[model samples]
Target: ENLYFQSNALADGKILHNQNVNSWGPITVTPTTDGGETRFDGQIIVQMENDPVVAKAAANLAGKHAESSVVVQLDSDGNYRVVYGDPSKLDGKLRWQLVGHGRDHSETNNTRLSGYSADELAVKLAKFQQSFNQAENINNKPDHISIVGSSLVSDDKQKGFGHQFINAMDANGLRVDVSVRSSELAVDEAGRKHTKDANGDWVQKAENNKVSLSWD
Candidate 1:
């Protein structure tokens, strides 16, 4: 469990000086910058069921949102992550379970962090969980976390998924923010334009389009 302990210490912003791990370091654990990008080395696991707000959301997801799991992670940049998945085995790395995009977005053209296989995502998530736990242990609270996603669907019902996701976190007492990005070209048949019709129901635009459905 050396790796686990080291990750915890880092998350707490505490130093484990004069300590060596498999030739890694007598290293100092603290936030630093690499190429002007913020980085933190640690791991943490958030027990959603323990958090009342998250527990409720999890229950809803288990019920209304079938075949889905809520995934969360804390990035090196100090951002807490949230994504939806198919009730699969999750060890903690940030993995987005994209649902739908509007008429203009495509996965290849989408800009944001992507491409973590199931195994890789698990290891990364496990580390994040360790770090987050340590931070909570030391401070008795979680750090600031945010959420991002895209919606090329209707403004009310389909887009409501994003709202539901954010609300779950917000109610859980975590800091929350949401961002929706766009794309220029429609990639698939589902990439049709979506808007409110005269009756307030969602309708398609003259041209089909898509949007970035994954988090940024």
Candidate 2:
């Protein structure tokens, strides 16, 4: 994830951080006391690779501990960090899994998967709606179901997708409220529009371009 540092004292100082032991090889930390000051002595220079496999391997290596050693590796960019206190406080089977998918703001190729395109995101939305509708069935469903989307990105070409989704719900006579998050690109279409079914089973509302998936 990110680097971490712990300093107990100058004389009894504790330095622990993160490391990618697979690419940088196996990294270990050693505590030393020189000139009446305690310090950690280990290899701090690690050349990290961006591949998710490599990142996961590094994370595992940094977290793995044995006996009385607490290893932590840190770098200048603060990309990785770890600190272990008591091995008894940790479970040997524990692990941290992070997604490589989604946007990467950095220029470096850290081996993470690329973000989805607008079409991809739209397709995902469509599939989800279809699956939900098919599984729940139109006549048998819950009274209150709200589907909220946040931090969504789209452009003029992709804007119509939201309308098409709302239209699908209206056609099926479903009580699903779909809310698309607001962004500068979707700001002009942001507002609340509601329509109640004649039978009064549910109400559908689109607010500020976000559909409210509501069931009454």
Candidate 3:
């Protein structure tokens, strides 16, 4: 029952705290880094599905589209920890094979941070997170992610999966000063508000950007 799963459905990059993957029936969860106002939550079993297994260890991986590395092990507390420093540090069978390059791009070059990456990429993302956090006095209303000037992690500096994704990021970068709507915080691959028609069936998930096929 300790298995966990995750997916970088967020339109940009973010670090998913931890996960636990045993032999087969994988149980998964998305833990958070924030100290408060953020609650780590559970994800559907099939989240962060399998990636292609390239034969050559020399080829760049196609899994670069993902954001964080899911590396963990059994600790003294019997709890699973998604450790960093490179998923490669673990054995082949036990290592997270979430690789794909093109599936590639970025400085870390530690595999590819598309879906997961080497430990070097992990710390970079660990920093970019503070670029902003969304909140509001009114529920479901217009609000903004106050660019924390004091944030040591320069959001404008780093690019790639380590960058915080927002609607008009490029525009803001170009100094266009445009405005975009919600799709701002993409936390899932399927529905915006999760009601769990959980893995209804495999419907070509790309076209509709939906995973729901029949009924949850």
Number of the top candidate by TM-score? 1
Q: Who is ahead in lDDT, 2 or 3?
A: 2
lDDT of 2 by residue, 148-215 (tens): 11223122213433334444555555433443322211100111112223342222343333333333
How far residue 136's Cα lies from its native spot in candidate 1, in Å, is 7.7
Off by over 4 Å in 3: 1-38, 44-46, 52-102, 108-157, 164-216
Please report, in order, the local distance difference test score of every candidate based on alpha carbons.
Answer: 0.28, 0.27, 0.22
Worst 10 residues of 2 by lDDT: 1-10
What lDDT score goes with residue 85 in model 2?
Answer: 33
Report the Cα lDDT for residue 32, model 3. Answer: 30
- A best-first ranking of the candidates according to their lDDT comes to 1, 2, 3
Per candidate, the number of residue pairs that clash is: 24, 17, 24
Compose the digit string of candidate 3's lDDT tens values, residues 124-187: 2222222211211211111122110011111233333323222223323311111111111122
Model 1 global lDDT (CA atoms, 0 to 1): 0.28
Q: Compared to the true structure, candidate 3 yields what TM-score?
A: 0.17
